[PDB]
Design a protein around this nucleic acid. Structure first.
Ligand SMILES: [Cl-]
Ligand SMILES: [Cl-]
Ligand SMILES: [Cl-]
Ligand SMILES: [Cl-]
Ligand SMILES: [Co+2]
Ligand SMILES: [Co+2]
Ligand SMILES: [Co+2]
Ligand SMILES: [Co+2]
Ligand SMILES: [Co+2]
Ligand SMILES: [Co+2]
Ligand SMILES: [Co+2]
Ligand SMILES: [Co+2]
Ligand SMILES: [Co+2]
Ligand SMILES: [Co+2]
Ligand SMILES: [Co+2]
Ligand SMILES: [Co+2]
Ligand SMILES: [Co+2]
Ligand SMILES: [Co+2]
Ligand SMILES: [Co+2]
Ligand SMILES: [Co+2]
Ligand SMILES: [Co+2]
Ligand SMILES: [Co+2]
Ligand SMILES: [Co+2]
Ligand SMILES: [Co+2]
Ligand SMILES: [Co+2]
Ligand SMILES: [Co+2]
Ligand SMILES: [Co+2]
Ligand SMILES: [Co+2]
Ligand SMILES: [Co+2]
Ligand SMILES: [Co+2]
Ligand SMILES: [Co+2]
Ligand SMILES: [Co+2]
Ligand SMILES: [Co+2]
Ligand SMILES: [Co+2]
Ligand SMILES: [Co+2]
Ligand SMILES: [Co+2]
Ligand SMILES: [Co+2]
Ligand SMILES: [Co+2]
Ligand SMILES: [Co+2]
Ligand SMILES: [Co+2]
Ligand SMILES: [Co+2]
Ligand SMILES: [Co+2]
Ligand SMILES: [Co+2]
Ligand SMILES: [Co+2]
Lengths: 104, 87, 100, 99, 99, 79, 106, 99
DNA sequence: ATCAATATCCACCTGCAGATACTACCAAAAGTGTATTTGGAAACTGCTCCATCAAAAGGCATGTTCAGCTGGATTCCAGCTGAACATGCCTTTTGATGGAGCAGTTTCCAAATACACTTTTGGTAGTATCTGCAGGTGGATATTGAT
DNA sequence: ATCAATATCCACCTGCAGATACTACCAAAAGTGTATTTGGAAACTGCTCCATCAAAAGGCATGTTCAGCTGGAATCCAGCTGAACATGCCTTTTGATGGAGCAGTTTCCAAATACACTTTTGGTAGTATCTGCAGGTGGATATTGAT
């Protein structure tokens, strides 16, 4: 019985407990901490795959590529802030042209 | 037999059409003639700084080969985190 | 198989893939996208583990507990992401402890 | 009766084209040579994983694109549409790459 | 028979006076009030160490002083000598606070 | 009120130290909102440090730690 | 105790403390004997660098005691110290006298 | 009186020592010394944290002076890096060569 | 230029906030002496991937020029809007004093680490076999700039 | 306003790069149990410093006048964009090749940990002395703005 199944999680509690020890963050790592962290991490993955899947769909694609991840993140105020100092390779920018630059 | 050719003036391989394309992606409509040399100047500083840290990491590992991880660590420590190349 | 045995390079890909199937059952992911996704989870893992690390220190605690992760999540994430992540993680710890 | 688009029409068209794609916009070899040159002035006899160089390109083109956005925004503040060296310098000063 | 200084003479005089000193320039109590009022929405019945409020004021005035520095640069970029909301807004956008 | 207790002459003094000569009328209100957002961001984080410590009093150190993580490190209160 | 590790290193800065703090700090499983020495030396040096220039600053303003104003002048007037402390605020330090030329009389 | 003492340690006495070596006729306010204590703690944490990372990138369980030295090179600007590197090797030598 | 008004400078002064100085006591920090444990440098070497060249196109995209349009730089000008200015008063500062709560101390147990079989699994390796989509296609709509 | 010279659109084609689908084996990871240790929650206390309000202090809200800065308008022209025109030694792409150097493995020893014991010490805490400079003055001199 994995601690993953036991917490209702697809992400690996055994690995996250492990990576927390290996990384010298504190002297002791409590039993709930890796459970809570694997949940947060899965929550956030699920959130970004949702938005990215949609972006895939909006462009008639069934395969998520980096463009989709980028549209997902940059179009979402919160993921955009959280990843405001990150660069997604092969993601491009958002189509945006400043008003004054259009003719009249 | 040993090749090794001299590398110089390679900043001018950053052509005027390539700078124009980057300006387009960045949404720029009109470009003054002095932009191209300004941009090359700016790129060189950028590259100098990342390569420096990147190569510092390489040397620390006692390697002669600059890995994608050296760049990624170097970029990360300058607050320009990159996804797509590992670690 | 096996060439002097290459040391194993572990990632989150099979788990990112499970979760992908849950939300978009007919959608796939390129290896490049899976690479961005694996970078993202590793990234966020480090940012939270380090706010946790710091917190513990600031309070003379030698243990990172779920209570350290929780505050780290509230420091790190914005608005709705923090609220939703806190409840999913609380959920998982409640469910985990009531099971023996 | 030969045909001519007016100044600005192909520019706007090019913006749409390039905002729409994700392909790297500097050619690979020229860029690789510039990396090898700059790195060689820091330390001789260096080799590069091909993806160390692609990482530097991705990072470099992303930094440059973002800077022109800021730069464009400084031109427009000055009631212009032409990016000038002094717009870049203002961008970089506020950004803290100068002060 | 009365005596008047030209517009700008006293402004310059103040710039010189205030750049020379280091004293906090917002009065303490209004600041303490505003701090507590903002804090109250995150948690009720809070007390504040007095050094907690001094640190918030130090940090806040340092931020606003430096932001007026960038704002002034943005005004000057647009060939003005009067700071406006658009200048503060340009600064914060390029600083990555609005971005 | 409160935000309005951050007076026009106080905002003008900050501008002066910032090297500012002439000031648009609309600036004082713009300066206030900017300051509000600044204190909201830092205090939020400081109070999250207080709650963790199971205290009812915001300490200088809660503030200093919040400022550090906003990338606005401050020297002089790290006792 | 024979000699402190500081005097063995020629240092005013506490090698024992720095060593202890590198352990208590969760930076690695282990800490070699030389690292606390190296780091204490680096810390002392940068201290000396800042006190030097802020000492100079005090003199220039006809004073014998270093106040935070002097540390601010010292640091901001030095290109390298100013870069190292580019995201730092020195409390009660103020600013450098600087007025944009376009704002100057007539 | 071992009660209300929970020992708060600081660099203040070691900073004061170095003051006298460089400026024997010069004093320092409490505020300014508090700032200097912050400087050392900050710089300590930055250097210590960068070495931690280096040791980790390279699968090493130990922070040696080599990690401190690379951390200094990565962290300090040009000339400051040079002398600090020179000071630290100097102190290690003096320490290794000591009876 | 004239020159009155007022800001600014410097010297000398003095009182006191805060800096020094010295003695004292005390935990904990720090060094010294001694078994024992192990990270990781050193030597050997498999085997991945980097540098290099050949040699074409898969010829793309660039550099150079020359035209001429129109955005930028200049100039002037009106009126609008912020700078200067003056002082009672109404708010902030400064000092005074309970009592909240932070910080100190001690108690004990739920959950931490150690650690040994036993079980489970993700990574990889290696071929084996689908499929989404780039890239080419026509060919039926959309925009632009000259009238 | 029409419309012709072009760019753009979107859906339906193909060949293949790259993605998912096998089954294998296995070292490492993860679960389970047991033996032993301890971090920090919890309950209690005292005194430190925080909120409150004594009055004593002084910065600023107010309106009015107008200097001068800012935006609007008009002009001019050069520096920019669009496009033709010749052609990379120029980039891309393909593909093979040798071989540097990274990374797997084993050995083994210097230096780390661990721990016990001695002694040294920095932080805290009164108690006393003492001094740098802030903020007072006076008298000189420079700056500014109306002539
Ligand atoms: Cl826990
Ligand atoms: Cl320019
Ligand atoms: Cl505005
Ligand atoms: Cl060492
Ligand atoms: Co959202
Ligand atoms: Co600490
Ligand atoms: Co919600
Ligand atoms: Co060279
Ligand atoms: Co790592
Ligand atoms: Co030197
Ligand atoms: Co006279
Ligand atoms: Co004089
Ligand atoms: Co006296
Ligand atoms: Co006193
Ligand atoms: Co070993
Ligand atoms: Co012409
Ligand atoms: Co025009
Ligand atoms: Co104009
Ligand atoms: Co007029
Ligand atoms: Co008005
Ligand atoms: Co009392
Ligand atoms: Co009392
Ligand atoms: Co109580
Ligand atoms: Co408490
Ligand atoms: Co109890
Ligand atoms: Co399996
Ligand atoms: Co495979
Ligand atoms: Co297509
Ligand atoms: Co066609
Ligand atoms: Co048209
Ligand atoms: Co159609
Ligand atoms: Co294939
Ligand atoms: Co205990
Ligand atoms: Co006028
Ligand atoms: Co104007
Ligand atoms: Co080969
Ligand atoms: Co070899
Ligand atoms: Co190796
Ligand atoms: Co002592
Ligand atoms: Co005296
Ligand atoms: Co005296
Ligand atoms: Co004075
Ligand atoms: Co006088
Ligand atoms: Co006087």
């Amino acid at each position: 019985k994995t601690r993953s199944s036991r917490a209702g999680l697809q992400f690996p509690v055994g690995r996250v407990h492990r990576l927390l020890r290996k990384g010298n963050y504190a002297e002791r790592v409590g039993a709930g901490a890796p459970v809570y962290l694997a949940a947060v991490l899965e929550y956030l993955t699920a959130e970004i795959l949702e938005l990215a899947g949609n972006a895939a769909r909006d462009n008639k694609k069934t395969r998520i590529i980096p463009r989709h991840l980028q549209l997902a993140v940059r179009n979402d105020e919160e993921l955009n802030k959280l990843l405001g100092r990150v660069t997604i390779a092969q993601g491009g920018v958002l189509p945006n042209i400043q008003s004054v630059l259009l003719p009249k | 037999k040993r090749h090794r050719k001299v590398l110089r003036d390679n900043i001018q391989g950053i052509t005027k059409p390539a700078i124009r394309r980057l300006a387009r992606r960045g949404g720029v409509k009109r470009i003054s003639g002095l932009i191209y040399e300004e941009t090359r100047g700016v790129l060189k500083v950028f590259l100098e700084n990342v390569i420096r840290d990147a190569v510092t990491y390489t040397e620390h590992a006692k390697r002669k080969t600059v890995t994608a991880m050296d760049v990624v660590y170097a970029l990360k420590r300058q607050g320009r985190t990159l996804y797509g190349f590992g670690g | 198989g096996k060439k002097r045995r290459k040391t194993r390079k572990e990632s989150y890909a099979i788990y990112v893939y499970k979760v992908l199937k849950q939300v978009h059952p007919d959608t796939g992911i390129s290896s490049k996208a899976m690479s961005i996704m694996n970078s993202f989870v590793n990234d966020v893992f480090e940012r939270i583990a380090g706010e946790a690390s710091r917190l513990a220190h600031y309070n003379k605690r030698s243990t990172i507990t779920s209570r350290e992760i929780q505050t780290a999540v509230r420091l790190l994430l914005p608005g709705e992401l923090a609220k939703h992540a806190v409840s999913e993680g609380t959920k998982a710890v409640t469910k985990y402890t009531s099971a023996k | 009766k030969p045909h001519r688009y007016r100044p600005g029409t192909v520019a706007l068209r090019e913006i749409r084209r390039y905002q729409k794609s994700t392909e790297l916009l500097i050619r690979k070899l020229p860029f690789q040579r510039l990396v090898r040159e700059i790195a060689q002035d820091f330390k001789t006899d260096l080799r590069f994983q091909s993806s160390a160089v692609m990482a530097l390109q991705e990072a470099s083109e992303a930094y440059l694109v973002a800077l022109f956005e800021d730069t464009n925004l400084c031109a427009i503040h000055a009631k212009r549409v032409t990016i000038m060296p002094k717009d870049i310098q203002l961008a970089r000063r506020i950004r803290g790459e100068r002060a």
